[PDB]
Amino acid sequence: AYRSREVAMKLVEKIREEAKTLDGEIRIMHVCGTHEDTVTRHGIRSLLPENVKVVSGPGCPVCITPVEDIVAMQLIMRKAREEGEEIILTTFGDMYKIPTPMGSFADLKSEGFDVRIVYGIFDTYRIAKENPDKTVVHFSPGFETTTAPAAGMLNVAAQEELENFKIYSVHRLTPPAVEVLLKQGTVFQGLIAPGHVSTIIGVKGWEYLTEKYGIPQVVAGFEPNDVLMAILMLIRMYKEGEARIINEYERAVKYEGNVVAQKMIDKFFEVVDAKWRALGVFPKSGLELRKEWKDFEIRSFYKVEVPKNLPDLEKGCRCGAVLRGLALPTDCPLFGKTCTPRHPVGPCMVSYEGTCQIFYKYGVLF
Ligand code: SF4
Description:
Rossmann fold; 15 helices; 4Fe-4S; metal-binding; carbon monoxide binding; Hyd_form_HypD; hydrogenase expression/formation protein HypD
């Protein structure tokens, strides 16, 4: 308590002191919704010196789930129903309300489809066991942190030979996003690596970025002091002209990552080029079930026709710029006007990890 406040004040003073002698403006990016929550909750952007910026990358797996996949899942529900098949669709609570030009999962539910909100894929497994006569499918988004438990449940279902347990895989990888943002402009000279994701892929998983682009990195937890320390460290590393990755979250992250989880994920999933809503196609950034485990993917059972020309976002939504770290929600003309948690225009406002929802949640009036 008193200690945390003491450290925070001292860290901000060091940041100010180091920043004074910066050539120009330094941009530090994070790609983790919880880091954004911490940053905004504690007003860290205002505390920083004018020449130090914290950029919010695409750290929301729900926000970037493609419209085509949500719509496709919806079309599979309809095609299965016309065949007399009662499918039970599970989804996280925020994904449940993600908008698309053809409606959300919640809209589908109001039509009488069996759509259920779950806390995790373990609930899907339980529901599958509760309804052996019904197909149970989890629309499954998520970065490495969420993919790990999905792989774990699949391994359990595989051992049991559960045949009514499926997923619609829309899992994504974080490092590739960081690479694309860099090549596509988005300027930043340091990275705060996500803590949870790092727990799975370890320091090892981010190294290629430092080796390929020379960008310094600090793996950090979510306390405001973890974020402040990371910022202080990246500034020093930058000024000192060094390209290294420092693990400030060793209590939860091993250099090698969680090898057990990594192996479990690779056992069922294969990395493919994948779409990221409002951002385009990122090569080798998505995960799909391997050919050997195709029976677990619902698309292996139903083929549907997603209509063409479906726009990624509703008119005026700047979620594209926001996910790129090129604009803050306050830069969006719909923010708090036509777009709010009650009536969201874009995915950035619905998602729990969404920068726009985070800005709203903390009453950012800016
Ligand atoms: S405030 Fe709404 S409309 Fe604007 S960028 Fe965020 S999610 Fe999109």
